[PDB]
Amino acid sequence: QPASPKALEEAPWPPPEGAFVGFVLSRKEPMWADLLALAAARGGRVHRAPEPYKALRDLKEARGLLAKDLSVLALREGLGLPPGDDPMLLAYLLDPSNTTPEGVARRYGGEWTEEAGERAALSERLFANLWGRLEGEERLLWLYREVERPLSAVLAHMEATGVRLDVAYLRALSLEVAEEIARLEAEVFRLAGHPFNLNSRDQLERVLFDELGLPASTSAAALEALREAHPIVEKILQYRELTKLKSTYIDPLPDLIHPRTGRLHTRFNQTATATGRLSSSDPNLQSIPVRTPLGQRIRRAFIAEEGWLLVALDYSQEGLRVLAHLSGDENLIRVFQEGRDIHTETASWMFGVPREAVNPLMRRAAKTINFGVLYGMSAHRLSQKLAIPYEEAQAFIERYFQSFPKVRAWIEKTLEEGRRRGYVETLFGRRRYVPDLEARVKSVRQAAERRAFNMPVQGTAADLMKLAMVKLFPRLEEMGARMLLQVHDELVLEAPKERAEAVARLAKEVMEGVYPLAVPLEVEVGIGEDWLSAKEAAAL
């Protein structure tokens, strides 16, 4: 028989100052959860709270794994318990593949279990280990102290505060989408010659392959191939598209209004993504359509409290400004410095015509490359998007890199340094490991290259936004305003109607002045009763 493992020593609540917390929720969403257990740990000693909710009052901060989530629940219960140290944040800075407590425990030692005392002891141990791993990493430590750890309190406020929704609007939008779905379904039935359950894979296989005799398997991948093969496949794809938007971004939202707050509590996570951008859940704001009429309409459902207004701020051409800075391209920097329309000025440079001779077609081409260049868009993709011959796409790309040669040089150098070193870095020194740059299979290596030279751009953009949020938040609290949402290049605030103007102007200032680049940062801002209106004002 084996020796028994060391047990945690246990002492009475409350714990001493600086203790690490562990906690178990009834479900993962803290705004919707019951706090089932609360423990704290210090120097191989664990303190279990007899009634969790009362025990929160004894803590000066939430220090441990998922600290932000405990802070959100505290805020829901009317208690201002700020998140402090969280080993998830350390692990994520060490390697952004570290996104879950179970993964971090597996990698760096211990085990993520369902018992609050063990989670408290795990938190303590993980912090010690990961803090040790970050010794002599000055830039990562600075990012931790100045961005990541303060940002966790900002995220707790956003999630706990939530956003008001227009339920009547959402019902009206739902009906409109239902009408379109019904129209498409009816067409599909006519083309098939009989009704069937469109959502049934078996029934749909019969129709496509056995009845219509289309080439032979009913996945979204499969139907994409056949999209042009028969008019019915196009209709099925649209039906699936609309059904998904309705069931993902429209119908669930009213049920996510919390009965106690009357608001939707979007869940924000700062250790979830490859690039370091913040991610959202319930809803995933990033997946709301941007361009389509339906996508814009969903944002009209997000409204301000009575007597308040939303303020929507967004960085203009954030990625391209970062690329100008990182590449040091003199021509690209000059475009931004001189403050003229970036895409027009780009077309002028590209086509060797004066800006006054730049036509819509030229501007559209310049704009497509200005966005595609960030992601490694191929000449083939460019030719498809502009509906021009491949050869002409190639010519445009050459004109672009003739105008902006250090952009091409920067791309090449980033991949070269990435191969040599095994990682790429943001401006603030966040590293992402990119082992597939040396992968044999050409397919996978090019996909890796695109993700690699994008990380400095999008990762830097994320860093700038996160620092802006950290700098802005206490100024907003002073003014009696709120920070609600972040997605893409954009930040949404809520302000008392009479303070909305002053909030907008201050937020624009803070965001534009967050960090000095070789080019100015530019932020557009709009004010409105709903998010879509605020965005429409900002684009005006």
Swiss-Prot record:
EC number: 2.7.7.7
Uses, biotech or industry: Used in the PCR method because of its high thermostability. Has a relatively high error rate probably related to the lack of exonuclease proofreading functionality.
Top-level taxonomic group: Bacteria
Region (Polymerase): 124-536
Keyword Lipoprotein included in the entry's annotation: no
Gene Ontology BP, a term: DNA-templated DNA replication
GO MF term set: 5'-3' exonuclease activity; DNA binding; DNA-directed DNA polymerase activity; nucleoside binding
Record key words, sorted: DNA damage, DNA repair, DNA replication, DNA-binding, DNA-directed DNA polymerase, Exonuclease, Hydrolase, Nuclease, Nucleotidyltransferase, Transferase
Statement: the UniProt record of this protein carries the keyword Lipid metabolism: no
Catalytic activity: DNA(n) + a 2'-deoxyribonucleoside 5'-triphosphate = DNA(n+1) + diphosphate
Function (record text): In addition to polymerase activity, this DNA polymerase exhibits 5'-3' exonuclease activity. Unlikely to have 3'-5' exonuclease activity due to absence of a 3'-5' exonuclease domain.
Similarity remark: Belongs to the DNA polymerase type-A family.
UniProt protein name: DNA polymerase I, thermostable
Span within the parent record: 290 to 832 of 832
